[PDB]
Design a protein around this ligand. Sequence first.
Ligand SMILES: [Mg+2]
Lengths: 207, 213, 90, 59, 89, 227, 250, 180, 255
Amino acid sequence: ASLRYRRPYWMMFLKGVDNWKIYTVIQQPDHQRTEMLYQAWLGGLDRPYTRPKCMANQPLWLSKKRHMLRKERLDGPETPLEKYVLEWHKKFHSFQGTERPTPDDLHTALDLVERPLDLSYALQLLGQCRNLNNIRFAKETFLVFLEACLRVGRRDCAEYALEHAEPLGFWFIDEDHRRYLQGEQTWYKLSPLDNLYYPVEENAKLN
Amino acid sequence: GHYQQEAFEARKRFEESTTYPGPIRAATPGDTRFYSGSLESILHDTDRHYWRAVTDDPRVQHLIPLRIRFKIFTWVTSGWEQRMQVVQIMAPKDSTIAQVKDLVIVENQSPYLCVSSFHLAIDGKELDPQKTLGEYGITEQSQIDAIEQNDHLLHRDDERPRDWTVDEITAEDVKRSPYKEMEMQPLQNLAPRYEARPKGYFGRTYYSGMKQS
Amino acid sequence: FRDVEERRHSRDVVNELPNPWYDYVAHALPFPDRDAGYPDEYGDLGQWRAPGGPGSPVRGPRGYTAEWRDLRNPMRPPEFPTPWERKYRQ
Amino acid sequence: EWLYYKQFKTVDYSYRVIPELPEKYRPHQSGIDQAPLPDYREINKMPQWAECEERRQSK
Amino acid sequence: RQIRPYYNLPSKSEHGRKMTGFLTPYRHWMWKQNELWRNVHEAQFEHLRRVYKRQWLESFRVNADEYIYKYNITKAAQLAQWECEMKEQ
Amino acid sequence: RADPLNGGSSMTLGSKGSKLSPEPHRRRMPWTAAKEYVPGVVLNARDKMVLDGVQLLDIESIDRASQLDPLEVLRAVVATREYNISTGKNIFQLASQATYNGRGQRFYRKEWQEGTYDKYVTLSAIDFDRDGNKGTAYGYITFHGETTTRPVQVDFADVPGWYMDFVEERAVPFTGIVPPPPSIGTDVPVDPHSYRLKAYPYYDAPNPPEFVERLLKDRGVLPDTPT
Amino acid sequence: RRFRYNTKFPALVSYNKLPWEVVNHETPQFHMHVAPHYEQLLTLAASSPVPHIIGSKHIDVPREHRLRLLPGMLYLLDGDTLPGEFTINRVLDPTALQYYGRLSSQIVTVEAVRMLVPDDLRLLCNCITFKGPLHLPVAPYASLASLRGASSNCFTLYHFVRPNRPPKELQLEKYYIHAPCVAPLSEFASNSDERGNWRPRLQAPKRTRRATPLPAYRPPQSYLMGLAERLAVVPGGCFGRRSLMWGHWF
Amino acid sequence: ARAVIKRRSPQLWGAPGAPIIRMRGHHVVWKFQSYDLVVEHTHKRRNSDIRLLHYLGKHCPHPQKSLWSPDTPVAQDRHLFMLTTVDIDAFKYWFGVKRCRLSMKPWALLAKAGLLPPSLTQNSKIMPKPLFDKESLMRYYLANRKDEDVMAREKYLNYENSMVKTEEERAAERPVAPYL
Amino acid sequence: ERGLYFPINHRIVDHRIAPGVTVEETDVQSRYRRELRTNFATGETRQTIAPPWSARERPTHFFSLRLPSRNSVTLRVKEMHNHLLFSHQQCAPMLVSPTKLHITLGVMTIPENSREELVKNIQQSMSETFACVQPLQLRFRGLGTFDFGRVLFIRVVPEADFGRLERAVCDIRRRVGGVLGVDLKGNPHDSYVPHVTVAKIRPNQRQQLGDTIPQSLWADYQHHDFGDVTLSTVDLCRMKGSPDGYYHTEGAVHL
RNA sequence: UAAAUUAUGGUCAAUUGUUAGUAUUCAUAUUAAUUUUUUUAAAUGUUUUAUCAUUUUAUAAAGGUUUAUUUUUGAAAGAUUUUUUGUAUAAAAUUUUAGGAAUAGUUAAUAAUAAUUUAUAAUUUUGAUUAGAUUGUUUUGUUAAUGCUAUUAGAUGGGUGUGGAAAAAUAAAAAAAA
Ligand SMILES: [Mg+2]
């Protein structure tokens, strides 16, 4: 069940690419013009361009150039977090990029939430940070997550994250915050300089 | 190992011997050019195509086949691979390094090897172009390589030749010397056919002299 | 298995007998040791020819020699008086 | 196994994968022009659930 | 061929063969027992192969020695006849 | 060649073995050299239906219209995490959850500690690419108390079958360098109390009674009647 | 086997030649290639005297002879000094510094490693400084015996090599004589006064009980890749002989 | 190593190699059927004569009465005869020196002839395939074990030179006094 | 496309390299035709091999066939020298004087301490061996190289009187180097090849005149005909021509 | 320029057609074969594996060749191990047609030359080159016999050139890693 004799030797160990026979017979006139038309259809170049001499995959430079020139969704970012999503995609989602984000970047992204849409975007970015990049969390990531959820009004997301934080990867959950979020305590943190017990709806008692 | 030292000792004592009228030229024949098989195979100066059961008198070698190893970046379909080429020159017994360089640049017969000035080195030590092989004690088994002007920075991608697989080749670049020989445009006959090997030919890692698994 | 089998084999009287198909190989050389019925150089069959003829490879070649001493005149009495029949002697 | 490997048109039935080559494989000559760019001014509209929960928060 | 048990690991892949090449630990153990019987026969087979080679080598040595003796006698006779004929010539 | 199994006997085609020698049979192809392998298809066949409980948002789908409720997004993240973990665990997933990327820890597979087999790897370094489940790892492979002198790149660092037990003492900070484990034979003097050998070069485990009974039942020497 | 001359393809075109092995100092594979040679050289120096390995001071060579004499030169110094006309690079790569783990643990803890590059970029000086005395014994006649680092305390080793060269470029093959140490024999030697303390025994003690048996064997529960004898893999996939089967699941 | 494999008649390790002894015979009416033990390569072309290292001999798979022998009252000697003509020297040369292979039918025929042990194919359904245990094998090995010197001597006699020269032959061969 | 796909001239395989390193480890690249160029084409002629002990000390005397200045070869080489000087003026020091041309039959080193007794025996042997041979005729044509092109000489093809000449020179070697001990550069049982030296690079001139005579100087005259010359005298001479402007006379036999 | 004999040796040579003045092997016999009385298919799923791959699986008829078809041990056999030793592409001879004349990227030297080197080049009436015919040097039939008359299956250009070797695009009487 070896294709080394069915196809040219240069295209061995090729998986995922569909119809390698197209690249085997690409030297024909009609196949060559079809390939040229397809590359022009994908665009990104001015001259009539074709695939290299013997390659069943697109060149890395051409693929990266087309990826960068690709029109991106969300043209108009309203909030600073909306702009931060664009710049994060620019830096840590470039084609063939070896860079990996940091929990400092995650905290900066999460601290810019103002709208519930901003909260949804930040939560999705956190989830992809922990699933795709698999980045270990810091001590205060859950603190900033709780602050964001409280100041955006999402109690249920905080409770859902608390109930099974271990699948979420939150290796540090404070006893004060767990008691507050499990319906046993009315406050979760105190301001050092202000000496008041957050949230404000609880501060209305102590004052 | 043992052959070189015993041959040197035998030659030394043969030179030291004084009671010898000399070998008979008629009795000692030379190598023949005609023999069976459709291949012209050259052997050592002490070997003959015919069966010679007697060991002839040792002789001083007046023509050493110096073999110089050049780097060569052949174009494989997967990518550029750096390999080794050997250029063999026939230099006299007392040829200086200057004439050795002349011989190697006249017998390289490769467009890429002699592109720029280079210096001959042995085991990493450069050779002085003023003294001859007598000072260095160079024999036919000596391993000599060459270092070019820009081989000390070949690790840089800019110095490395740019393959069309990962790098973009411009309209000005297709008019350059190597990239004109290479053809990025797949012709119907595919005139520039090169050696091809799969990306997974050596596995997940490249070729190495050690084990990484 | 080998030890039990050889111990069993050594206990049988019918064994320890020569087995020509096993203890030796008769002739390993390709060519035979004597011609047998193959056509002669003249084209004659084996039945029409006998060995030892001119086609066989050649056998090859002051005083008195060593074979002169044993020869004696029949007039002189024989060394050993074997009673030969007169008819056979003639 | 044999049913899965039959349709790949293996002459010797050697458990190989040789997908058939269609006459029209690329979309451009299959009959479609450039891929339609999505309406950005429509996809940028905030979703109805988002508006509802925004109003709920404002409550 | 190589036997593939029904109770083996099912490759949950539609793009390839429906069964894997692995096996149950019991299957590995029972395979070793079967392979042990294969070694019992082949070891006798290999030993018989070597002794047959030795016998053939010895027979070749003896027969070749005899043939060399006879051939040398014949060629000496031929050369003697040739030199006698040369003297007569 | 190098490893003529049962000598050069060629009684059957299977007498030579499935593979003739550990070295590649053809000089051209180096990859065909004999090496330990694990089932790639089974280990990478991650559970697909387990993600059918809740929808998953695509990375390139960033438009506002396709955004979902944050609770649903968190549910999707949990589903993706459990989907990754369902088939098993790889050292790239254990390293981020262990301090100092788990340097100096002992990693072993499930089949590496079953039966007389006993092998593990002492982690020395891990390089992470963009993906958190990909990259490379290097360490010292230890087999029955004998360890490699130089670090080697681990094989199959991506397949979800790895296990590791976290110990703080063996953790090595980035300031230091992971030390190779001592060899039970040469480096540290042998002691049965500290370590006892499970299999020696001429050892082979006795036949278990359950396997013996199953083989006899299969061969039919033992009586068997259907219920 | 490979015993054929090239006649199928022209000599000018290298059609199936193996790639030449090249070591780059921008990659950790350089440390991978060089570290075991370093530890072997240190062991040889500690066991037997080695010429040209001890360095009183940094060698001074003119520029013209710099590429002629420096390459292949390896020695050691007592002080932590660096040659001039070299830009310094510190090893901040954990993968790069991982390869010196055996040297640090078994032989001598390494304090730092630095790569020095000249202004002309035609050389590489690997300078590795070890802090602390050698863990292994040092003979009084050895080269390291003249080094004050053994018995500041840290001592460094300098190695010069041309960049972008085959692994044979460094002349570390000659430093492989396996001179043994006399650590156990020195105890019984005449100079040491433990000869009377040591008590030899000629007869083995009598055995009263058999050795404790191995624990109960449990067959593996996971699936198996197959027999190693047939698959031609080494017992544990690491070392051993294919014919001699051991250390596997059975 | 072919683009389209001849699926009907495949082989192993390609052609041409591993000479193997088989039993070739044209498919005719059974009453006129007779095979030919012969050594040939693993791969054969349309005509078998292309790859024919040596010819071993005919075999007639027809039990026949011994008409050549006189009518004897011996019961065993009056059983049917299955005549087979085989070569010994060439068979030994190809088996040992060249290390050829054999198929099951020639192996069974040679086992009947006494040249080879019984083939793995022929087995009695009455006796099942046994199993082995390391402890019992070690116990038997300790119970009986041959001496290393004698085992080395017998191995040398079986494998290396066996026709040795004793002191009587050496004394006979040694030169006579006049040339001493 | 011009001819055969693989020319016969390019099917060269080198056995000086290891067997298994040319296929994969490396590829040797060189022009192998230069070393296989035949001696006939390159002008090399196999001179008698001198033993190491006799190859150190410089020669003292040499046998030559004395010829009158009027002989045809002298003017043929004169015209050759004229052509060479007209074509290139830098080979004049390499070219020898036309009056210093002789046909050498043997070279030897007589020590100066005991030269007086040896020269009498040599001259009497020459007289007694040439008292019977009639004057010889030799046809000179062709060019050759000795000492790796250091010495350029006119070849002497076999012809009439050449067999008598070689028999006479063998007898001379037997009667000079055989019975009495004199250092002959070659072997007494070997025959010296006669030649007349037209060009030669001195060891002192080796510093600036290159290492060998380039072949283009005499390529056109490599097979030139220099004609038939009759020799009727022999002379044992010494390397001293400057003082008298002629060959030094040490022994002479009017053949 | 002498006979034979210690006597058949050394192992089978044997011809058959009833015509038709004569000349010349030519109607009708015998053997061998074809022909009537209805004898007479070339099978469809090769297999294993580490899974979108890799490993093993090398001469069927197609194309019309007479100065012509020639080569490997690098896979396998193959063995304590490492290691080692060698090759080989080239030849020679036999070559058809009733009425018989020119043939050509061409010969040699040189060389890892020359679409553009040097030379009085090479093939052929001792039958060439194109064209027609036919798969080449162990096969039959007939006869007492130097003859006459038959024979088969398969090597038909390259063009990312994998492989040890292209023989690589349906065609078994080939058991192909338990
Ligand atoms: Mg024709």
